[PDB]
Write an enzyme that holds these catalytic residues in place. Structure first.
Site, PDB file in Angstrom:
ATOM      1  N   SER A   4      24.704  43.990 -14.763  1.00 46.93           N
ATOM      2  CA  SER A   4      23.828  44.964 -14.062  1.00 46.93           C
ATOM      3  C   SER A   4      22.616  44.220 -13.538  1.00 46.93           C
ATOM      4  O   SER A   4      22.787  43.218 -12.817  1.00 46.93           O
ATOM      5  CB  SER A   4      23.531  46.138 -14.988  1.00 46.93           C
ATOM      6  N   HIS A  52      30.979  50.782 -14.715  1.00 54.60           N
ATOM      7  CA  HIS A  52      29.706  50.068 -14.788  1.00 54.60           C
ATOM      8  C   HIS A  52      29.786  49.006 -15.878  1.00 54.60           C
ATOM      9  O   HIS A  52      30.022  49.342 -17.042  1.00 54.60           O
ATOM     10  CB  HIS A  52      28.570  51.042 -15.069  1.00 54.60           C
ATOM     11  N   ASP A  76      30.883  50.762  -7.907  1.00 54.66           N
ATOM     12  CA  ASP A  76      29.951  50.639  -9.022  1.00 54.66           C
ATOM     13  C   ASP A  76      29.102  51.905  -9.160  1.00 54.66           C
ATOM     14  O   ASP A  76      28.599  52.450  -8.165  1.00 54.66           O
ATOM     15  CB  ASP A  76      29.067  49.402  -8.832  1.00 54.66           C
TER      16      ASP A  76
HETATM   17  C1  LIG Z   1      20.034  47.262 -14.132  1.00 49.83           C
HETATM   18  O1  LIG Z   1      21.045  47.820 -14.781  1.00 49.83           O
HETATM   19  C2  LIG Z   1      21.508  48.931 -14.159  1.00 49.83           C
HETATM   20  O2  LIG Z   1      21.497  49.868 -14.880  1.00 49.83           O
HETATM   21  C3  LIG Z   1      21.970  48.900 -12.690  1.00 49.83           C
HETATM   22  O3  LIG Z   1      22.091  47.605 -12.155  1.00 49.83           O
HETATM   23  C4  LIG Z   1      21.081  47.148 -11.269  1.00 49.83           C
HETATM   24  C5  LIG Z   1      19.987  47.956 -10.969  1.00 49.83           C
HETATM   25  C6  LIG Z   1      19.002  47.481 -10.114  1.00 49.83           C
HETATM   26  C7  LIG Z   1      19.105  46.205  -9.585  1.00 49.83           C
HETATM   27  C8  LIG Z   1      18.044  45.658  -8.639  1.00 49.83           C
HETATM   28  N1  LIG Z   1      17.259  45.241  -7.939  1.00 49.83           N
HETATM   29  C9  LIG Z   1      20.182  45.388  -9.901  1.00 49.83           C
HETATM   30  C10 LIG Z   1      21.158  45.873 -10.742  1.00 49.83           C
END
Ligand SMILES: COC(=O)COc1ccc(C#N)cc1
Ligand SMILES: *[C@@H]1O[C@H](CO)[C@@H](O)[C@H](O)[C@H]1NC(C)=O
EC number: 3.1.1.98
Length: 338
Positions: A145, A286, A242
């Site tokens: 993530s 996810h 995603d």
């Molecule tokens: C972070 O974990 C999550 O829940 C979703 O993943 C992401 C969210 C925001 C960003 C940025 N900029 C990159 C990845």
């Protein structure tokens, strides 16, 4: 179990000034080291970070961290749960900087919060060398993530840091899970990233920064823009649909939404066409690599642990490393998580 160590350099802190740290389980008979970056969105101004501090404090502070954590998925030491790297030295770096691992700003009379994610990674690497990393052959920087986006932002800097500390023999690689996003049109975010980089004093990899230049460094948070600029080998794991992507696209089925979802999968597939090491199933989900059942998903008949082993062989016939689904709807792959 992995055991907690708080950083001896107490000037490298989480958001609220408490020391950052890392969880470690050593494997004395191994020259392989895995450093995993946790995710968990981010915050981009005072009020937004205040709300996070009320309800997500473990992502902003080490004061309530437990002294151990159980390694799962790629962090498991059990061959059955982790066919790829079960014998490696395992490190889990908790996310407590709320900056997508990009910040380099201390708490001060002018700053309510510290954002030091990029400095946290480098200090963990420095302190680990004295615990056996100095005899390593490969350092794999992985993450899920926002931690997966953090791999893209930091892998080349880890390699440059060891290259000039006198360790040219350690091979630095990256594994980015669920961190590969599109800056597409919403069905019904880039500004929040632009404001966050300013609030964080965030930094991005050097060649990417020189391409986009002042005020546009937010472009380097999107994988298909920053990956072409990277020098280190990077394996990209990415669900085609995603959950975090659909969230920032305001998607929560009529013709309009159908075409929207099919176009999203097609565009993500296209951004991976020239990524030679990649694993992208047609699932709505996810993260994957720290899940206990990460061995279950397959693309074109090959599992993720196998693809990663094939990647290892390619860097040293029937051992593929580029695995991208072509079917156009979530769960057209029968091995998607239920
Ligand atoms: C972070 O974990 C999550 O829940 C979703 O993943 C992401 C969210 C925001 C960003 C940025 N900029 C990159 C990845
Ligand atoms: C501690 O970390 C800070 C931030 O990276 C750095 O400026 C400082 O030189 C470090 N001090 C020591 C003794 O490592």
């Amino acid at each position: 179990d992995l055991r907690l160590h708080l950083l001896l350099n107490t000037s490298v802190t989480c958001n609220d000034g408490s020391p950052a740290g890392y969880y470690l389980k050593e494997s004395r008979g191994s020259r392989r080291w895995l450093l995993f970056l946790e995710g968990g969105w981010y915050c981009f101004n005072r009020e937004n970070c205040d709300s996070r501090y009320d309800t997500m404090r473990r992502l902003m502070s080490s004061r309530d961290w437990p002294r151990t954590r159980t390694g799962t998925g790629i962090l498991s030491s059990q061959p059955e749960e982790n066919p790829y790297w079960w014998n490696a030295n395992m490190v889990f770096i908790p996310y407590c900087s709320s900056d997508v691992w990009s910040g380099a700003s201390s708490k001060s009379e002018k700053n309510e919060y510290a954002f030091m994610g990029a400095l946290i990674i480098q200090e963990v690497v420095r302190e680990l060398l004295g615990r056996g990393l100095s005899g390593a052959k490969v350092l794999l920087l992985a993450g899920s993530s926002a931690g997966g986006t953090g791999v893209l932002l930091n892998v080349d800097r880890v390699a440059e840091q060891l290259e000039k500390l006198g360790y040219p023999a350690i091979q630095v690689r990256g594994l980015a899970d669920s961190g590969w996003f599109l800056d597409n049109k919403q069905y019904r975010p880039t500004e929040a990233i632009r404001r966050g980089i300013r609030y964080w004093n965030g930094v991005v990899p050097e060649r990417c920064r020189r391409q986009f230049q002042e005020g546009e460094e937010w472009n380097c948070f999107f994988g298909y823009k920053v990956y072409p600029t990277l020098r280190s080998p990077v394996f990209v794991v990415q669900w085609l649909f995603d959950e975090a992507q659909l969230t920032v696209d305001n998607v929560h089925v009529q013709e309009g939404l159908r075409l929207y979802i099919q176009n999203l999968g097609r565009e993500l597939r296209h951004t991976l066409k020239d990524v030679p090491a990649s694993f992208a199933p047609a699932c709505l989900s996810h993260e994957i690599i720290i899940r206990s059942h990460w061995t279950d998903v397959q693309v074109k008949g090959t599992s993720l642990p196998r693809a990663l082993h094939c990647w290892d062989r390619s860097l040293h016939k029937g051992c593929p490393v580029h695995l991208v689904d072509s079917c156009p709807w979530p769960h057209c792959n029968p091995s998607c998580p239920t």
